[PDB]
Every structure is written in structure tokens, then in C-alpha cells.
């Protein structure tokens with residue numbers, strides 16, 4: 001019988017590509033989503049047509065708050081409700097916007113940027129571990145963590161904490177047979193609304209191909225880390241950036 | 250006139266050593282504390298006896314919350330109130346206890362560990378910068394890439410603190426504000442003390458609070474005016490020891 | 493036409509695992525070896541028995557010297573000689589022994605340890621790129637930052653291999669050549685090592701209290717050479733079962 | 741008596757600043773140089789004018805070769821023969837020039853770049869330790885080692901190896917009371933170089949949009965050898981004005 005995976009922020013872009021590739025490998029999937037209800041319902045529908053009852057949706061705000069621990073518990077619970085097991089967790093959902101040091105109040109930005117990128121991944125890891133073969137967690141990190149976007153401190157802080165969690169949980173969940181890893185994109189799928197001239201600026205910086213990663217190319221690294229070809233890999237963060245992080249100012 | 254420094258969690262231990270050494274260098278100091286009210290007022294008394302009106306205390310909880318941004322703005326305000334300037338911020342205060350993945354609720358654990366180690370440092374950096382040899386020193390951890398078992402939340406916080414150090418160094422550079430870090434390995438029963446001390450290659454002993462303070466003192470000095478975004482490890486070679 | 497790979501130090505252990513894996517993926521392989529003549533030809537025969545004209549050996553010392561640049565060019569020329577192409581280079585050959593700060597002369601020790609681990613990979617990368625799904629995989633070390641006591645030269649060589657991996661990824665990207673690394677923690681332990689000492693290194697590993705089979709190392713190599721890694725360059729994948737994460 | 745220090749490549753620039761500042765702190769100094777004879781002797785005179793018998797020169801090529809171990813041994817010996825002690829070693833000398841992957845032969849380029857940046861520091865460390873207060877070594881590294889200059893593989897390999905040595909010798913010499921540390925400049929004293937190309941690197945630096953003076957680099961070395969660093973070993977301090985933090 002088929003294994004089961006939870007992907008957070010799976011309605012669009014990289015998340016969707018991961019969910020589709022897991023499903024194409026034979027996984028049953030939980031499509032978590034926040035605002036993108038149409039895209040998530042559509043994806044589940046697409047996957048369920050391919051193979052009956054192998055996909056479900058689950059909505060949750062992953063912003064840090066008093067109810068976040070129960071919300072994360074419920075995301076993991078929904079995988080057990082649907083498929084009776086939870087083998088894989090992909091922490092993909094992420095808030096990304098500038099928070100300059102010099103509409104939203106700063107406490108809200110903290111909650112969103114640190115909640116989505118670090119706290120929720122931790123709380124979901126807790127529930128995954130507590131609710132338990134080839135078990136693994138893959139955390140979507142950032143290849144540019146040590147060369148951050150200007151005025152993106154809280155985002156960068158969340159992504160840094162996520163590296164911390166990847167390492168801490170790898171160590172702690174190793175005795176339980178749970179591997180914990182990361183995939184770190186540099187520049188992948190850029191916003192559709194972003195001018196092509198602006199997209200090009202980031203594209204011209206990538207040594208390998210002068211272009212951004214596809215969502216599928218990121219998913220390819222996730223599939224590897226969850227596979228049997230990685231049964232000894234834990235606490236590792238695989239960069240998928242085409243050399244971007246190696247380019248100086 | 251004398252420059253002013255804010256040191257969080259400065260009532261005891263490493264924070265006390267940092268406040269004292271900054272004071273001995275000529276800084277007027279704000280001794281932030283949380284629960285150690287007695288020790289902070291005692292330290293403020295000691296420093297003021299040496300030089301009149303060069304030390305004040307400032308109580309604040311640095312657990313994460315919706316009021317934390319205003320608690321951090323007040324700490325900086327308290328430095329301008331007492332001394333009319335704020336040249337140095339030392340982010341020393343830190344919650345440290347295990348949080349295994351498998352009567353403190355997890356929401357509280359997250360609030361205290363991420364709050365003290367990361368979010369409070371961030372908000373203080375904000376208020377510090379907004380109010381302006383200016384520099385910030387963040388007390389990091391030499392063992393962040395080799396963490397204590399079951400310390401995910403503490404380690405997540407210290408990792409974020411690295412992220413802040415580097416992001417704030419880049420962003421506050423055009424303002425002349427340098428942002429740096431000091432990362433202790435083993436610093437401040439007997440058998441467990443002995444166990445950690447034996448692991449340190451250099452002298453098989455822990456760092457004295459003053460040795461850590463020495464690294465803070467270098468980073469705020471004129472001898473470090475081109476240094477920003479650097480984290481100086483003060484660990485006696487501990488991080489270099491394999492399992 | 494089937495692609496061709498060069499694997500250095502492929503007569504035994506991890507190198508053989510990588511060579512066999514590539515061959516099973518349909519690669520034609522140059523089995524480079526130093527002393528282990530019998531083992532290399534024995535692997536060559538076994539791979540040729542499965543598919544005709546798909547494996548050859550290549551003897552070469554990779555100790556640092558003035559002739560080493562020529563020796564590296566020849567390893568690469570040898571892949572073109574046999575297969576008319578060279579698509580993949582795996583820098584695996586490695587000297588590993590202590591060199592205490594406080595019997596081989598120190599210049600010999602420098603030549604072998606920096607030679608095999610750093611300079612030879614640099615020279616082979618040179619020759620690989622000159623002679624042109626192209627990629628290079630370098631066998632690194634997960635413990636480069638918590639090194640074995642008294643292994644300064646070996647560690648310096650491994651650190652230099654990281655420098656090379658990143659430098660060459662940057663420089664050979666516009667040419668379509670990807671450069672990546674695989675960093676084992678404890679994998680296949682020395683033949684000379686007794687079972688008591690082996691278990692000591694085994695017990696350090698969080699993930700299964702065991703070393704990586706040569707096959708598990710090769711799996712990481714095969715990923716990086718495959719089309720599943722077309723955007724991955726300058727990446728060093730730890731395959732250490734979380735060993736590097738464990739403090740003293 | 742006054743402590744003694746060896747500074748390699750001390751005739752001008754950063755090396756000179758370190759020697760001048762160490763001497764200013766109360767150190768007697770061995771000024772090592774390769775080609776800058778007039779500059780080293782000139783510095784020796786200047787420092788000896790300030791305090792009699794506190795400065796000497798020592799000439800050596802630090803290019804890797806069979807005679808390099810003996811060369812490094814004699815550099816350390818020049819400190820003992822003149823001052824009776826050797827308390828500090830600053831590994832500052834360095835070859836730096838492009839070595840593209842695609843009339844100096846490559847074997848020479850390897851010898852010069854890996855020799856000066858990695859192997860000579862290793863052999864000097866060996867000699868320093870074996871010949872043995874406040875004993876420490878400072879290795880001059882590079883803040884941009886993980887975002888290296890294009891076509892500078894050999895130089896970057898050498899600097900990566902120097903990190904390796906700094907960390908390896910830190911662990912191994914810790915029981916002997918010898919501390920091993922690093923100072924990593926970003927853009928410091930140029931080149932000469934085109935002023936247009938100089939200002940291009942300057943504008944990249946977040947802190948001040950300027951390069952570090954040699955004095956500012958020396959400040960970090962002085963800190964590392966000072967009593968204010970008695971617990972610091974295996975640490976590499978960046979003096980880069982934030983340069984290493986700036987994305988492409």
C-alpha cells in the first residue's frame with residue numbers, strides 16, 4: 001500500500017511541483033494551503049482523477065499564534081484521517097516580504113515571517129514525530145541565507161532558524177529512524193507579475209544557464225531526499241541554485 | 250562626554266561582566282534585567298559609586314508577544330532618557346532549556362526561546378537604529394551547528410540571531426552602525442560541570458565571563474571599525490572537536 | 493552513443509561502487525588505479541563481461557609533482573582514446589594518514605596528501621574542461637570542520653577540494669559543466685582497522701549507529717550526475733547520517 | 741624579556757602594518773620577505789631606530805618544493821638565533837594571480853599559490869611548535885573564500901587549505917598552549933591596478949564604500965595575539981566591511 005506525504009503551501013508553484021512529483025512517485029498527498037483554495041481544490045481533483053482518493057486538501061494559517069500548535073497537529077491529523085499513515089513532511093509554505101529596520105504592525109510581521117518559515121515547521125515536526133519504512137522531513141530553505149536580500153531580516157531570520165531546526169531534528173529524530181533534510185533554492189520561479197526586465201536581472205546572475213530554477217527542478221531534489229537513494233542522508237541541506245550563492249558582490 | 254551602552258540580561262553572569270567592562274572603558278550603562286532585580290540594583294549601585302550617574306537599571310520581559318515591540322522601544326528610550334544617547338546595544342539576554350520534539354506549554358516555550366534569543370534582539374536593533382562609533386553585539390553560540398540534544402527551539406533562536414547579525418550588518422551599514430557577534434562555547438552538579446570542561450581543547454576549562462566580555466569590548470572599540478557582520482567564536486576549540 | 497565516465501581510485505571500495513553504479517546506469521567507465529592492478533583489471537573484466545568494450549583501466553600516480561599535470565591530462569586523454577568522449581569525472585582517489593605537527597619525509601607527505609586530495613582533482617578538472625550532461629563530482633569529507641586529531645595535511649587537502657568544487661562550479665558553469673561534491677562521514681573503514689575500533693566509529697553515527705555502505709555514497713554521486721540534478725552545481729551533499737552534527 | 745614574532749611577507753602593505761603594530765606593542769620582529777629587499781631592510785632600520793635590537797630580516801621563497809621544509813625551519817630559527825624565543829607567528833605571505841581552468845607552467849602556479857598560502861604556513865607551524873606566556877599563530881585568510889574571484893581556483897584552494905590548517909592546528913596545539921587563529925580581509929589595500937577597477941571593488945563594501953587600511957587589518961591580528969584573546973583558538977575573524985554579506 002502507498003506511502004503518504006504532507007506538503008505545506010502545495011497549491012501553487014514549487015509546493016505544487018513537489019506534491020505532483022510525490023504523487024507521481026506513488027505517494028498519497030495532503031495538499032495544505034492558506035489563501036489559494038481554488039488552486040488547491042483543483043490540484044487535489046487533478047490527482048484524484050489519476051488515482052482514486054490519493055489526495056486531500058487542508059487549510060491552515062501558519063502564522064505564529066496561540067492556536068498554531070493545534071493547527072499543525074490538525075494538518076498532521078488530516079493525513080492520518082485520509083491515508084492512515086504519515087511518511088513524509090515537506091515544509092514548503094513561506095511568507096516572503098521586506099521588513100526594513102529603519103499596513104502590518106511589526107508583531108504581525110514577526111508572527112507571519114517567523115511562524116511560516118520556522119515555528120510551524122517545528123510544530124509540524126513535533127506532531128509528525130509524536131504521531132509515529134522510510135520516514136523523512138524535507139525543509140525548503142534558502143541558498144542565499146548568508147547573503148540576504150536587503151531589508152529582509154525577519155525572513156532571513158526565519159530561514160536561518162529553519163536551518164537550525166533541520167539540524168536539531170535530524171540529530172534528535174535519528175534514533176526514531178526519521179531523516180531530516182533541506183532543499184535550498186537560489187532563484188526559482190519568479191512572480192508572474194514581476195517585470196521580465198526585473199526577472200532578467202536575477203537570471204543574469206545565475207552562472208549555470210543564466211536562468212531561474214523550474215519548480216520541477218526543486219522538486220527533483222526533494223524526491224531524491226525522500227527516496228531510498230538517500231537512506232543515510234540526514235541533517236543535510238542540498239543547494240539547488242545553479243551557482244548563484246557562489247557569485248560575489 | 251561618555252558614550253552609552255545598553256546590555257540586556259546584565260544583572261548576572263556574562264551580561265554583568267559585559268556591563269562592568271564597558272563601564273570600566275568609560276561607558277554609561279543601562280543594566281536591563283528580568284527577574285534578578287536585586288542583583289541589577291546592586292550592580293547599578295557599585296558602578297555609580299565609581300562614577301556618579303553612569304548606571305541605571307531597566308526591567309523588561311523579552312518573551313515574544315504583541316507588546317514586545319513596545320517593550321524593546323522602551324529599553325532604548327530608557328537609554329536616551331538617562332544619558333541622552335545610545336551608542337552600543339548588547340543582546341545578551343537568553344532563555345535556555347530543553348524542548349524535546351517527542352508546566353510550560355509549547356506556545357510559552359516558543360515565546361521565551363525565540364523571543365529572548367531572536368525577536369527581542371531584532372526589535373531592539375530596530376529601535377536602536379530608528380533612534381540614531383555605533384555598534385551592536387549579539388551573544389550567539391559557538392555550538393549552533395552541533396547543538397545539544399532536544400534543544401530545537403533554543404537552537405532555532407540562536408540560528409535566527411546569526412541571520413539577524415548578518416542582515417542588520419548589511420542594512421545598517423549606510424548608517425555607520427556595525428553589527429557583530431560573540432559566540433561562547435562553554436562559559437559559566439560538579440560531575441556534569443567536569444564533563445563539559447573536559448571537552449575543551451584549550452586548558453580543559455570553561456570561559457570566564459570576563460574572557461567573553463573581552464571579545465565584546467574589542468568589537469565595540471575603534472580597533473574594530475571595519476568589522477561588521479562578523480561572529481567571533483570564544484570557545485577554546487570546542488566547536489572543532491568531533492564526536 | 494553511451495556516455496563515458498572517469499573514476500579515480502576505482503579498483504576498490506567507494507571508487508568501485510561509483511564505477512559499477514555509473515556502468516549500471518549505462519556509462520562506459522575508465523577505472524583509474526594506482527597500486528591495485530589486479531583489482532582494477534578484475535573490475536574491468538567483470539564490467540566488460542556484462543557489456544562489451546565499456547570498461548578500461550588507467551594506471552596513474554596522483555602524488556604532487558612537476559609531471560602530475562601531464563599524468564592528469566593522460567587520464568583524460570585515455571577516456572577519449574577508449575570511448576571518444578568524456579562526460580563525467582569523479583575525483584575519488586585519496587591519500588589518508590596522520591601528519592602530526594609535533595618513515596615518509598614531510599615533503600613526500602605534502603605531495604601525497606595535497607596531491608591526491610586537491611591538486612590532482614584541480615588538474616583533472618583542467619584537462620576535463622579543456623578536452624571538450626557534463627559534470628564533475630568530488631569526494632569530500634563531512635568532518636572537515638571537526639577534523640581527526642593530527643590529520644592537518646589530509647584536512648588541508650580536503651578543505652582545498654571544497655575550494656576547488658566551488659571555484660570550478662563558478663568558472664565552468666558557462667561551459668555547461670556542473671561541479672558538485674559528496675561528503676561521507678564514516679563510510680567503509682580501513683582494511684587494517686580492527687573490529688573493536690570500527691564499532692567505536694560506528695557508535696558515533698546518530699542514524700543507525702552504522703557506517704555508510706559504499707553503495708550509499710555512490711547513490712549521492714549518481715544523483716549529482718543524473719538529470720535530476722541539472723540545476724545543481726557547487727553543492728556538497730553530506731552523506732554522514734548526521735555525524736557532523738554531534739558535539740564532543 | 742620582550743616577546744618575539746615572525747611575520748612572513750612583512751616588507752610592505754598588510755605584512756608591514758602587522759610588523760609595525762606588533763613592534764609598537766613591544767614585540768621584537770623577524771621581517772620575512774621574498775623580493776622586497778630594500779623595503780624589508782628599510783623597515784628593519786626604522787624599527788631598530790625606535791628600539792635597538794628588536795628587528796631583523798629573513799629572506800625566503802615560500803614556493804612549494806623539496807627545500808621548503810628546511811626554508812621554513814630556518815625562518816623560525818632566525819627568530820630564536822636573534823631573540824632566543826619565538827612567541828608569535830603571522831602567516832601573511834601570499835601569491836595571488838589568476839589560474840584559469842580553460843609563461844608560468846601550471847606546476848609552478850601550483851607550487852607558488854598552494855605553497856605560499858597553505859604549505860609554508862603548515863611547515864612554519866610545524867617548526868614553531870616543535871621549537872617550543874602567550875603563544876599563538878595568526879593566519880591571514882580571505883573573507884571571500886566561499887564567493888571567490890573568477891578563474892582563481894588555485895589561490896582559493898590555497899586559502900581554503902589555510903582555513904583547514906587554522907582549524908587543524910588549533911585542535912592539535914591546544915594542549916601545548918598554542919592558539920591558532922585567522923584574520924580574513926575582504927577588500928583591503930589595493931593595487932598597482934586601474935583606479936577605475938579599484939573604485940569598483942570599493943563601491944561594493946557596505947561599510948564606508950572603501951577598502952580596509954593595512955592598519956585596520958593589523959588591529960585584528962593584534963587583538964588575536966593579545967591577552968584579551970586567551971580563550972580564542974580556531975577562530976577566523978572577518979575584517980571585510982560587510983563585503984562577504986552582499987549578494988551578486
Ligand SMILES: NC(=O)c1ccc[n+]([C@@H]2O[C@H](COP(=O)([O-])OP(=O)(O)OC[C@H]3O[C@@H](n4cnc5c(N)ncnc54)[C@H](OP(=O)(O)O)[C@@H]3O)[C@@H](O)[C@H]2O)c1
Pocket residue numbers: 008009010011012013014015033034035036037060061062063091092093094095096112116140141142143184185186187188189190
Ligand atoms: N521562488 C524562489 O525563487 C525561492 C527562492 C529561495 C527560496 N525559496 C523557498 O522555496 C519555497 C517555495 O518557493 P515559492 O516561491 O513557491 O513559495 P511562495 O509562493 O512564496 O509561498 C508558498 C506558499 O506559502 C503559503 N503561505 C504564505 N503565507 C502563509 C501563511 N501565513 N500560512 C500558511 N501558508 C502560507 C502560500 O499559500 P497560499 O497561496 O495558499 O496562501 C504560498 O502559496 C519557499 O519556502 C521559499 O522560501 C524560493
Ligand SMILES: NC(=O)c1ccc[n+]([C@@H]2O[C@H](COP(=O)([O-])OP(=O)(O)OC[C@H]3O[C@@H](n4cnc5c(N)ncnc54)[C@H](OP(=O)(O)O)[C@@H]3O)[C@@H](O)[C@H]2O)c1
Pocket residue numbers: 257258259260261262263264281282283284285286309310311312340341342343344345361365388389390391432433434435436437
Ligand atoms: N554560558 C554559556 O556556556 C554560553 C554558551 C553559549 C552561548 N551563550 C550565550 O551567551 C549569553 C550569556 O550567557 P549566560 O550563561 O550568562 O546567560 P544566562 O545566565 O542563562 O541568561 C542571562 C540573562 O538572560 C535573562 N533572561 C532570561 N529570560 C529572559 C526573558 N524572558 N526576558 C528578559 N530577560 C531574560 C536573565 O535575566 P534575569 O536573571 O534578570 O531574569 C539572565 O540573567 C546568552 O545569550 C547565551 O545564550 C552562553
Ligand SMILES: NC(=O)c1ccc[n+]([C@@H]2O[C@H](COP(=O)([O-])OP(=O)(O)OC[C@H]3O[C@@H](n4cnc5c(N)ncnc54)[C@H](OP(=O)(O)O)[C@@H]3O)[C@@H](O)[C@H]2O)c1
Pocket residue numbers: 500501502503504505506507524525526527528529552553554555583584585586587588604608631632633634675676677678679680681
Ligand atoms: N571511507 C570513509 O569513511 C571516508 C570518509 C571521509 C571521506 N572519504 C572520501 O571518500 C572517498 C572514498 O573513500 P575510500 O575509503 O573508499 O578511499 P580509499 O580506499 O582510502 O582510497 C581510494 C583509492 O585512492 C587511491 N590512491 C591513494 N593514493 C594515491 C595516489 N598517490 N595516486 C593515485 N591514487 C591513489 C588508491 O588506489 P590504489 O589502491 O589503486 O593504489 C585507493 O584505492 C575518498 O576520497 C575519501 O577521502 C571517505
Ligand SMILES: NC(=O)c1ccc[n+]([C@@H]2O[C@H](COP(=O)([O-])OP(=O)(O)OC[C@H]3O[C@@H](n4cnc5c(N)ncnc54)[C@H](OP(=O)(O)O)[C@@H]3O)[C@@H](O)[C@H]2O)c1
Pocket residue numbers: 748749750751752753754755772773774775776777800801802803831832833834835836852856880881882883924925926927928929930
Ligand atoms: N589585500 C587584500 O585586499 C586581501 C584580501 C583578502 C585576503 N588577503 C590576505 O591578506 C594577506 C596580506 O595581503 P596583501 O595584499 O598585503 O598581500 P600581498 O601584497 O599580495 O603579498 C604579501 C607578500 O607576500 C610575499 N610573497 C609572495 N610570493 C612569495 C613567495 N613565493 N615566497 C615568499 N613570499 C612571497 C611578497 O613578498 P615580497 O614583496 O618580499 O616579494 C609580498 O610582499 C595575504 O595573505 C592575502 O592573501 C588580502
Ligand SMILES: CC1=Nc2c(N)nc(N)nc2NC1(C)C
Pocket residue numbers: 093094095096142187188189190191
Ligand atoms: C524570488 C522569490 N523568493 C522567495 C523566497 N525566498 N521565499 C518565499 N517564500 N517566496 C519567494 N518567492 C519569490 C518572490 C519568487
Ligand SMILES: CC1=Nc2c(N)nc(N)nc2NC1(C)C
Pocket residue numbers: 343345392397434435436437445
Ligand atoms: C554546557 C553548556 N551550557 C550552556 C549554557 N549554560 N547556556 C547556553 N546558552 N548554552 C550552553 N551550552 C553548553 C555548552 C551545552
Ligand SMILES: CC1=Nc2c(N)nc(N)nc2NC1(C)C
Pocket residue numbers: 586588640677678679680681682693
Ligand atoms: C574512521 C575514518 N576513516 C576514514 C577513511 N578510512 N578514509 C578517509 N578518507 N577518511 C576517514 N575518516 C574517518 C571517518 C574518521
Ligand SMILES: CC1=Nc2c(N)nc(N)nc2NC1(C)C
Pocket residue numbers: 833834835836882928929930931
Ligand atoms: C584584490 C587583491 N587581493 C589579494 C589577495 N586576496 N591576496 C593577495 N595575496 N594579494 C591580493 N592582491 C590584491 C590585488 C590587492
